[PDB]
DNA sequence: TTTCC
């Protein structure tokens, strides 16, 4: 089954992905690199006092606060869903190798027993229904841009001036490009408007993966993360091998002299795809209006913020099932892409825009550097984009693509297993829409809250309920997959968008509460995804602009965990053991410094406020803006705070652009 | 200078 074309950096096909400037050339050549991160200023992730601290802390908590999770996967008691060994990683040092992106997932999906299209007319109706509800009656907004992000292929600029320039130009030429594409003239489209080429595969860290402590061994054991080699990825898993990356940290002593305590490992690595910006611009301009619609009209199932926000919806349920999906992104079906593109055409969207959109979801990928002596290889032909990688991380609508898939999938699961008496209501398109419209507002007997694959599925009182409980039982035994479309299962330790649902002895939603995930406080504070980048002097451009600020939001975020107090205390104690410092002091110090330095970037303060008008959301986002693109959205952040991190584009120009794109 | 709501 179609092997994918592969090209080497040397090849003209690859050469043309990188413009004649130094940054772009350097991107194409970039080699496997690694090294201890600067966890906080002047502190390395492998500093022996720090590692000693992680050894003591991690053990102490695992010991005194073992997970309270039932059978079932509801958490109770202490609010701990797992051990605390997650912090035992040499942050900045990757597992070897990273995976190669699969060029085609059709086999992956076939072997997994997953449908290659809607299976029943009902589902086909519901998927198109979801397209219609989401992409209709949209309100124009200005295209926002992360400060310091890359335009990737082919210029690799972080100059806002140049980004705005590119974006604006892209909205003008979007139409010619799509039409060109409609004519099969992809190369022309890429050469004239930089729309096409490929994704740039950047490997990012997941600093905290599973590590258990073997009862029989006494040795810690790292979770095995499976990865593909070149052959696997090009052949969709026909040839080649799929195997376990090595997290073994011993190489760290031999190579770099670094001292490696027992039970510490190299970090997991997630592949990440950077989009050609000229192509993503036209897409983001529409994606954001769509996000806006769903978080307004279908706020029930889609718009989540405060822990009380979630609790209010769920407490009304008789049953709450916490699902989750395995490797959602690599599994995501291209048939969905096509269907989405189809109904969008039927709604009367611009054919040339649906074509841009379509293409963005079948684009080749530039594989950079999964390992030493590896990478620098283009997968797929940009002349005729035909890759089926699943969902490309930096596509511009990837949250929405995920949401579309999983929201319907989930509803379907509910129907199939719990609410047959509901099918008579989904006869045609209009009836389907009205049903979906109702379902999403939370007006039916089956309910759902979700962001992409993370969901909690809900049953009120009624006929579905009994079915609900069986579904839940089906999910526990785990012998049979409840969906035709994706591999679904119950979360072992139920939690939604970061907050744990804390059940009491009743084990019912009614007497359940949302508290923060204490383990997340730890991951965030001692195992950050990036270093502090103290070389970057413009902090709005740093991955972690104002680390110290999280101290001020700690109480609001995590103060509701049953063991909050005890955890801060254990830290203090272990930190004193390891540093002869008050950890608390060191934070309050850093809180102060970053608070001053902030007034600089928010002239709209600007010192004298003091931490002022800032909500907890702001404070966590300032310390970690990576929370814009998974947890919170625009209108959850104060407007003068947004403009520190983001930058807009001529509203006239988006407004003009949108108009030529949409039906009405 | 490293992509993603
Ligand atoms: N919000 C948020 N999510 C994270 C963070 N780190 C990891 N994740 C999420 O954790 C999820 C783990 O997904 P998987 O790749 O399937 O790992 P897994 O849940 O163990 O999957 P299985 O191997 O099937 O058990 C990812 O999809 C991420 O979205 C983080 O720092 N913040």
């Amino acid at each position: 089954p179609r092997r994918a074309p592969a090209f080497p950096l040397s090849d003209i096909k690859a050469q043309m992905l990188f413009a004649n400037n130094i940054k772009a050339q350097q991107a194409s050549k970039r080699s496997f690199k690694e090294g201890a991160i600067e966890t906080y200023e002047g502190l390395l992730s492998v500093d022996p006092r720090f590692l000693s601290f992680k050894n003591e802390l991690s053990r102490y908590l695992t010991d005194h606060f073992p997970a309270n999770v039932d059978e079932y996967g509801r958490v109770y008691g202490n609010g701990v869903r797992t051990n605390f060994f997650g912090m035992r990683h040499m942050n900045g040092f990757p597992m070897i190798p990273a995976t190669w992106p699969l060029a085609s997932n059709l086999k992956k999906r076939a072997d997994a027993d997953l449908a290659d299209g809607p299976v029943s007319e009902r589902d086909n109706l519901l998927f198109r229904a979801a397209v219609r509800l989401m992409f209709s009656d949209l309100e124009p907004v200005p295209l926002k841009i992360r400060k310091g992000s890359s335009t990737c292929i082919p210029y690799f600029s972080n100059d806002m001036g140049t980004k705005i320039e590119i974006a604006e130009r892209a909205l003008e030429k979007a139409e010619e490009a799509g039409n060109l594409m409609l004519q099969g003239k992809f190369d022309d489209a890429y050469q004239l408007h930089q729309m096409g080429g490929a994704y740039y595969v950047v490997y990012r860290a997941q600093s905290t993966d599973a590590i258990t402590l073997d009862p029989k061994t006494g040795k810690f054991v790292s979770k095995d993360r499976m990865v593909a080699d070149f052959e696997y990825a090009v052949t969709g898993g026909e040839q080649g091998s799929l195997f376990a990356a090595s997290k073994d940290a011993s190489r760290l002593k031999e190579q770099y002299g670094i001292d490696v305590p027992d039970g510490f490992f190299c970090e997991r690595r997630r592949t990440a795809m950077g989009g050609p910006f000229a192509l993503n611009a036209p897409i983001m301009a529409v994606a954001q209006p769509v996000r806006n619609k769903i978080y307004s009209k279908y706020a029930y199932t889609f718009h989540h913020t405060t822990r009380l926000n979630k609790e209010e919806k769920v407490k009304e349920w008789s049953l709450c099932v916490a699902t989750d999906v395995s490797d959602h992104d690599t599994f995501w079906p291209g048939w969905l892409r096509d269907l989405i593109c189809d109904e969008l055409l039927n709604m009367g969207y611009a054919p040339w825009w649906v074509k841009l959109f379509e293409t963005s979801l079948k684009l080749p990928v530039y594989v950079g550097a999964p390992a030493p002596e590896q990478g620098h290889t283009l997968l797929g032909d940009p002349s005729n984009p035909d890759l089926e990688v699943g969902l490309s991380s930096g596509q511009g609508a990837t949250d929405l693509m995920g949401t579309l898939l999983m929201s319907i999938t989930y509803l379907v699961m509910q129907l199939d297993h719990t609410a047959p008496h509901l099918n008579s209501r989904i006869k045609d398109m209009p009836s389907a829409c009205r049903f979906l419209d109702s379902y999403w507002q939370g007006h039916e007997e089956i309910r759902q809250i979700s962001k992409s694959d993370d969901a909690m599925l809900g049953w009120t009182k009624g006929r579905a309920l009994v079915g609900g409980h069986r579904l839940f039982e089906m999910l526990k035994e785990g012998k049979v997959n409840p969906s035709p479309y994706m591999k679904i299962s119950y979360q072992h330790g139920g939690a939604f968008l970061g907050d744990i649902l804390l059940y009491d002895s009743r084990r019912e939603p009614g007497s359940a509460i949302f508290v923060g995930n204490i383990n997340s406080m730890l991951n965030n504070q001692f195992s950050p995804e990036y270093g502090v980048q103290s070389g970057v002097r413009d902090r709005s451009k740093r991955k972690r602009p104002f680390p110290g600020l999280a101290w001020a939001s700690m109480k609001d975020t995590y103060g509701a965990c049953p063991i909050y107090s005890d955890v801060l205390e254990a830290i203090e104690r272990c930190w004193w053991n390891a540093f002869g410092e008050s950890y608390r002091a060191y934070r309050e110090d850093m809180l102060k410094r970053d608070t001053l330095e902030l007034s600089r970037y928010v002239a709209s303060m600007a010192r004298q406020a003091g931490l002022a008008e800032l909500t907890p959301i702001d404070l966590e986002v300032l310390a970690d803006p990576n929370k814009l693109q998974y947890k919170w959205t625009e209108a959850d952040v104060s407007a003068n705070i947004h403009e520190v991190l983001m930058h807009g584009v001529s509203v006239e120009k988006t407004e003009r652009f949108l108009r030529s794109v949409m039906p009405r």
Side-chain angles (χ1 to χ4, degrees):
Chain A
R2 297 154 126 292
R3 155 198 280 239
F7 306 103
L9 185 52
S10 90
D11 205 85
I12 190 52
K13 296 269 200 199
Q15 277 307 121
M16 301 210 61
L17 300 175
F18 307 96
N20 206 8
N21 80 51
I22 290 180
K23 277 226 273 265
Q25 290 309 105
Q26 212 171 293
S28 68
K29 276 153 168 150
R30 160 48 81 208
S31 282
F32 178 86
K33 181 133 72 164
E34 65 179 337
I37 63 175
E38 197 176 20
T39 303
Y40 295 116
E41 258 152 4
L43 215 226
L44 260 22
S45 58
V46 294
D47 168 300
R49 316 111 93 205
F50 193 51
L51 296 191
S52 164
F53 167 76
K54 280 169 149 190
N55 175 80
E56 187 174 5
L57 192 51
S58 76
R59 284 182 199 265
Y60 181 80
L61 307 192
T62 296
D63 220 351
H64 291 55
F65 308 98
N68 299 176
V69 197
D70 70 20
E71 29 146 15
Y72 295 116
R74 333 176 188 96
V75 359
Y76 58 96
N78 55 199
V80 174
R81 50 171 290 269
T82 183
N83 73 82
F84 295 79
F85 301 133
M87 63 191 58
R88 309 192 134 251
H89 294 280
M90 310 297 277
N91 302 320
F93 294 91
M95 54 175 197
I96 320 271
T99 189
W100 280 73
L102 262 59
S104 160
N105 60 359
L106 311 178
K107 191 185 153 54
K108 177 166 190 50
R109 289 189 49 93
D111 295 357
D113 266 357
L114 305 173
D116 61 9
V119 10
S120 41
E121 179 57 17
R122 183 194 66 192
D123 300 4
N124 170 70
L125 273 178
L126 292 178
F127 284 107
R128 282 160 194 280
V131 176
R132 290 201 150 152
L133 291 202
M134 283 180 155
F135 283 85
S136 64
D137 317 329
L138 297 179
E139 306 283 350
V141 308
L143 202 175
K144 291 298 187 197
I145 297 189
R146 231 289 51 176
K147 272 165 194 183
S149 52
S150 195
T151 71
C152 301
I153 299 200
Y155 302 121
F156 296 85
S157 208
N158 326 83
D159 179 66
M160 181 63 67
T162 303
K163 296 227 277 302
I164 289 166
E165 228 171 68
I166 294 173
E168 294 188 337
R169 172 80 184 174
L171 298 192
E172 296 177 341
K173 292 315 182 197
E175 187 176 338
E176 302 186 6
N179 285 323
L180 275 163
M181 286 186 193
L182 294 168
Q183 302 168 45
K185 309 200 281 186
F186 287 105
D187 285 341
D188 286 358
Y190 175 66
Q191 273 132 227
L192 287 163
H193 308 292
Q194 296 72 60
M195 291 188 191
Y199 284 96
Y200 184 71
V201 181
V202 17
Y203 289 101
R204 92 178 15 244
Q206 215 225 304
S207 57
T208 42
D209 208 345
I211 297 166
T212 63
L213 169 45
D214 193 327
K216 21 267 139 48
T217 299
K219 285 190 292 181
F220 294 100
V221 172
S222 78
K223 167 90 149 190
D224 275 33
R225 285 306 164 176
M226 297 300 178
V227 311
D229 53 17
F230 173 81
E231 273 289 307
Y232 202 100
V234 274
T235 71
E238 292 286 353
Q239 283 76 81
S241 55
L242 187 55
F243 63 101
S246 179
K247 292 191 178 167
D248 164 276
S250 289
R251 58 183 191 77
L252 295 197
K253 170 64 181 180
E254 318 171 48
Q255 281 179 106
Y256 307 91
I258 305 198
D259 203 305
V260 174
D262 186 60
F264 279 63
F265 314 79
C266 294
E267 283 165 334
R268 183 194 196 164
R269 269 247 200 113
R270 327 275 271 170
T271 107
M273 286 165 183
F277 192 71
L279 174 59
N280 277 158
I283 296 169
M284 289 156 68
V286 184
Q288 185 47 63
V290 173
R291 279 183 206 95
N292 285 339
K293 169 155 190 171
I294 54 183
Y295 299 148
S296 50
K297 191 170 175 183
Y298 308 111
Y300 183 87
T301 128
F302 293 124
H303 186 249
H304 321 289
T305 54
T306 106
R307 286 191 321 239
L308 292 306
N309 177 2
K310 296 172 189 166
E311 196 156 342
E312 282 163 1
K313 290 170 189 165
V314 166
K315 269 211 296 267
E316 280 300 66
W317 294 4
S318 296
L319 181 44
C320 166
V321 173
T323 56
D324 77 320
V325 190
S326 60
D327 208 352
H328 165 85
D329 276 4
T330 59
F331 265 117
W332 199 90
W335 57 257
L336 196 53
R337 176 202 50 234
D338 300 318
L339 178 160
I340 292 171
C341 278
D342 199 67
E343 201 62 21
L344 283 171
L345 285 187
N346 294 333
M347 295 171 59
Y349 261 78
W352 58 257
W353 188 88
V354 173
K355 193 57 171 182
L356 288 189
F357 191 85
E358 186 185 58
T359 296
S360 66
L361 291 170
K362 6 218 284 200
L363 210 70
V365 308
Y366 184 76
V367 181
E373 306 307 312
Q374 265 198 48
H376 302 171
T377 294
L378 176 55
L379 306 180
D381 186 340
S383 286
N384 199 225
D386 69 346
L387 254 51
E388 297 273 335
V389 313
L391 237 180
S392 319
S393 154
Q395 178 264 351
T398 106
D399 63 342
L400 304 166
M401 289 304 94
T403 283
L404 201 303
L405 180 57
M406 298 310 311
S407 197
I408 298 314
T409 295
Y410 280 140
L411 167 64
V412 177
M413 200 186 320
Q414 272 172 347
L415 301 168
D416 293 342
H417 294 282
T418 82
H421 58 279
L422 282 191
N423 302 306
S424 72
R425 296 190 45 188
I426 306 159
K427 307 143 85 72
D428 48 42
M429 269 301 288
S431 61
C433 294
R434 301 187 258 102
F435 181 82
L436 190 49
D437 176 82
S438 183
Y439 177 66
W440 278 348
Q441 301 194 27
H443 298 141
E444 298 281 335
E445 153 185 331
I446 46 171
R447 304 201 170 154
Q448 140 194 353
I449 47 176
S450 62
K451 181 158 188 144
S452 279
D453 61 305
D454 200 16
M456 276 188 175
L457 296 191
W459 286 261
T460 57
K461 283 296 167 92
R463 312 201 277 187
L465 179 35
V466 48
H469 284 285
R470 259 208 316 288
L471 174 46
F472 192 10
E473 201 69 74
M474 169 168 309
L475 281 166
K476 182 185 122 48
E477 266 135 25
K479 294 179 182 186
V480 166
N481 193 355
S483 184
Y485 303 125
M486 300 289 284
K487 285 214 163 281
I488 309 307
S489 31
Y490 77 101
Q491 295 199 46
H492 212 302
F496 185 53
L497 253 38
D499 302 305
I500 296 157
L501 183 46
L502 187 60
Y503 288 90
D504 68 10
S505 58
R506 318 204 46 241
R507 306 288 203 257
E508 296 202 39
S511 29
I513 58 161
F514 274 120
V515 318
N517 180 355
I518 202 62
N519 203 76
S520 307
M521 195 189 70
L522 297 171
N523 291 346
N524 278 191
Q525 275 173 223
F526 309 116
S527 264
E529 196 157 317
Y530 304 84
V532 299
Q533 272 158 322
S534 50
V536 185
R537 224 164 315 150
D538 180 356
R539 294 164 79 116
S540 57
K541 282 183 164 181
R542 298 182 177 176
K543 299 284 171 171
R544 302 159 60 203
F546 306 93
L549 294 190
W551 198 245
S553 44
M554 184 185 42
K555 169 68 88 72
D556 309 58
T557 298
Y558 307 105
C561 312
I563 69 181
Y564 182 73
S565 200
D566 296 332
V567 169
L568 287 170
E569 158 181 283
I571 288 176
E572 190 69 20
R573 188 178 55 69
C574 285
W575 193 270
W576 228 359
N577 290 333
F579 289 108
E581 300 279 43
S582 154
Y583 175 70
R584 182 158 59 239
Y586 164 84
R587 280 329 224 99
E588 279 153 0
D589 215 311
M590 187 194 304
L591 204 220
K592 210 187 277 190
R593 273 148 49 216
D594 287 358
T595 300
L596 259 287
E597 191 69 30
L598 180 62
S599 65
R600 281 268 205 78
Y601 292 79
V602 189
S604 276
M605 181 189 156
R607 209 187 318 167
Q608 309 258 39
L611 264 160
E613 330 268 271
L614 293 180
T615 71
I617 291 180
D618 300 355
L619 288 188
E620 290 266 345
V621 160
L622 279 168
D624 194 350
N626 214 275
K627 283 168 145 90
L628 298 175
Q629 43 205 179
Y630 75 48
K631 179 158 182 168
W632 297 310
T633 29
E634 255 255 43
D636 305 338
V637 187
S638 302
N640 55 336
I641 285 300
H642 214 240
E643 29 168 281
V644 174
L645 301 180
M646 308 287 283
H647 206 303
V649 185
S650 171
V651 188
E652 305 102 44
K653 280 184 192 202
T654 28
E655 184 159 18
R656 177 148 102 43
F657 168 87
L658 227 62
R659 184 153 56 257
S660 74
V661 163
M662 307 214 271
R664 312 274 57 86

